[PDB]
Design a protein around this ligand. Structure first.
Ligand SMILES: *[C@@H]1O[C@H](CO[C@@H]2O[C@@H](C)[C@@H](O)[C@@H](O)[C@@H]2O)[C@@H](O[C@@H]2O[C@H](CO)[C@@H](O[C@@H]3O[C@H](CO)[C@@H](O)[C@H](O)[C@@H]3O)[C@H](O)[C@H]2NC(C)=O)[C@H](O)[C@H]1NC(C)=O
Ligand SMILES: *[C@@H]1O[C@H](CO)[C@@H](O[C@@H]2O[C@H](CO)[C@@H](O[C@H]3O[C@H](CO)[C@@H](O)[C@H](O)[C@@H]3O)[C@H](O)[C@H]2NC(C)=O)[C@H](O)[C@H]1NC(C)=O
Lengths: 102, 439
């Protein structure tokens, strides 16, 4: 019993003196498009196991990075709007600033 | 009207091209390559075959010393052995006991079998391309055999088809080709006159009929056993016989791109490499004015089923109102979707059925029938079968070719993060503006 892997371009198999057999893969999946997010990833993962992982890994990395940037900008804005108050000898912080930033 | 299109260099897969000549009803031509052949120019360097070692009856000089002469024979050696006392069935060969010499000589020459059993060492250069093309022209199946060098026009019902040149110069054959029978090998054979014993090329000849033979067999004459007249020798066994056992797989089985290899002449067939341009010259007589042709209006497309399988698993039903009875061309407006039918028969107020193949998870495409376009859309499902015995009738997908719901999820997630960034950016800009406003 021999298990042969079939490339997307197809596989040719010759058995003895018989004419060669040719095989091509189908785009079969257990996941599905038009389903839940995890079913969609499974669909594309099964069809394109390396392209899908690279796209998902990179997209996830970038999206998380952009969130980190949004937070970093918020913290920068926070320090800039608060500092001028903390340096005041009789500093009093407006409620909205106290609630929103502090 | 000159129409220029390009089809992938594949065999057994039909491609459809639209001939669009404004003012006239559109034509769709279905072209299928049945065979593509690359025939390399060959220059014979030499041939090899099994050699035979020729050993003339030994000369036994009794009561004296023999001497030998040099000869020009392909691989010649002579040696005189002293102290020989050979016996025949009836007793000792001659009168003297120890004062005897034997002259042994031998040479290598091509065996009689070299006329049938030989390998040819060729230098391969460029290849002439030719192909057999099936064309569906105005509903008829015409098969044309033509050269694919771009220099041959073959007529199909008064239309001229020029095929090639092929976009890829790739060939399965290397510069050095060795051919035995039906088997071709990419072997780096030694230069003529540079052969080695026990290896391919140990015996070489420029042509099958040539008497000019090069040989390097390391033929060494040995001293005969006492009391005998035989001539022993040590020689490297034919490299041809060794090669035949050690040939390994031929290009027919090892070549890239599924190339089929044949000999007499040497040919590479059906290589799935690159693509092949086709130029079609269609006479004005072959065109029907749009006013004479059937015209469709009030068209609407519905797709009751879709499977993105290699075969034509998709079906679409299109409603139409035909101005008159007649045949009508059908064309896909997207490369992602292949339609099986080139033409349909339509009349009155009815619906037409077409089959299609796509790799798309979500099939979004337009179909042009008698210059009238419709928009089709479907959710396609995967096949349960994992393997088929035929190539896909559809093209591959790009990175942008994703399902509708996948695109929606991407937009929701991308927009969600983009919104958070846009808000954070706005807050920072506002704070900085306030910081700049203050002194
Ligand atoms: C133009 O030619 C195509 C392709 O067929 C070619 O011409 C034929 C006359 C033969 O010489 C073929 O060897 C050659 O490739 C025609 O399309 C083909 O039609 C045949 C039926 O005539 C289809 O075979 C059927 O397939 C089904 C499903 O497997 C079986 O159940 C049937 O029993 C039968 O075998 C064949 O699949 C089909 N091929 C394609 C790609 O569609 C085309 O009809 C013909 N047109 C005209 C006007 O002649
Ligand atoms: C979708 O899920 C299917 C199972 O729910 C799966 O089919 C099964 O796949 C396994 C390998 O992962 C096959 O091999 C197993 O079973 C055989 C006996 O049938 C054993 O000899 C093996 O050692 C192993 O345990 C199953 O045979 C196969 N069963 C069926 C009914 O197909 C599909 O492959 C999944 N599809 C995709 C695209 O992943």
């Amino acid at each position: 019993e021999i298990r042969l892997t079939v490339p997307t371009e197809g596989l040719e198999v010759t058995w003895g003196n018989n004419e060669p057999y040719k095989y091509w893969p189908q785009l079969s999946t257990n996941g599905t498009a038009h389903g839940h997010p995890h079913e969609i990833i499974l669909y594309y993962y099964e069809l394109y196991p390396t392209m899908t992982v690279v796209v998902v890994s990179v997209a996830s990395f970038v999206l998380l990075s952009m969130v980190g940037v949004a937070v970093g900008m918020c913290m920068c804005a926070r320090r800039r709007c608060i500092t001028p108050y903390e340096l005041t000898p009789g500093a009093t912080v407006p409620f909205l600033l106290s609630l929103i930033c502090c | 009207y000159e129409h220029v299109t390009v089809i992938p260099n594949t065999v057994g897969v039909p491609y459809k091209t639209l001939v669009n000549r404004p003012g006239y009803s559109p034509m769709v031509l279905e072209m299928e390559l049945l065979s593509v052949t690359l025939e390399p120019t060959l220059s014979l360097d030499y041939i090899t075959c099994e050699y035979k070692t020729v050993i003339p009856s030994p000369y036994v000089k009794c009561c004296g010393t023999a001497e030998c002469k040099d000869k020009s024979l392909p691989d010649y050696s002579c040696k005189v052995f002293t102290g020989v006392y050979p016996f025949m069935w009836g007793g000792a060969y001659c009168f003297c006991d120890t004062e005897n010499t034997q002259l042994s000589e031998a040479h290598v020459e091509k065996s009689e079998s070299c006329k049938t059993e030989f390998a040819s060492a060729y230098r391969a250069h460029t290849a002439s391309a030719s192909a057999k093309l099936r064309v569906l022209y105005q509903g008829n199946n015409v098969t044309v055999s033509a050269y694919a060098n771009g220099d041959h026009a073959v007529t199909v019902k008064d239309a001229k088809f020029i095929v090639g040149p092929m976009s890829s110069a790739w060939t399965p054959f290397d510069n050095k080709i060795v051919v035995y029978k039906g088997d071709v090998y990419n072997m780096d054979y030694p230069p003529f006159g540079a052969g080695r014993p026990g290896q391919f090329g140990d015996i070489q000849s420029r042509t099958p009929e040539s008497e000019d033979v090069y040989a390097n067999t390391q033929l060494v004459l040995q001293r005969p056993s006492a009391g005998t007249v035989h001539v022993p020798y040590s020689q490297a066994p034919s490299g041809f016989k060794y090669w035949l056992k050690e040939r390994g797989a031929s290009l027919q089985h090892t070549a890239p791109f599924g190339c089929q290899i044949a000999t007499n002449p040497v040919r590479a067939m059906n290589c799935a490499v690159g693509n092949m341009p086709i130029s079609i010259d269609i006479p004005d007589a072959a065109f029907t004015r749009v006013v004479d042709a059937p015209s469709l209006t009030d068209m609407s497309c519905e797709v009751p089923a879709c499977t993105h399988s290699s075969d034509f698993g998709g079906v679409a039903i299109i409603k139409y109102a035909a101005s008159k009875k007649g045949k009508c061309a059908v064309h896909s407006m997207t490369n992602a979707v292949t339609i099986r039918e080139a033409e349909i028969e339509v009349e009155g107020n009815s619906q037409l059925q077409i089959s299609f193949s796509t790799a798309l998870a979500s099939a979004e495409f337009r179909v042009q029938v008698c210059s009238t376009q419709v928009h089709c859309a479907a959710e396609c499902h995967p096949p349960k079968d994992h393997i088929v015995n035929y190539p896909a009738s559809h093209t591959t997908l790009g990175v942008q070719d994703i399902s509708v719901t996948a695109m929606s999820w991407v937009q929701k997630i991308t927009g969600g993060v983009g919104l958070v960034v846009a808000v954070a950016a706005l807050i920072l800009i506002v704070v900085l503006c306030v910081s700049f406003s203050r002194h």
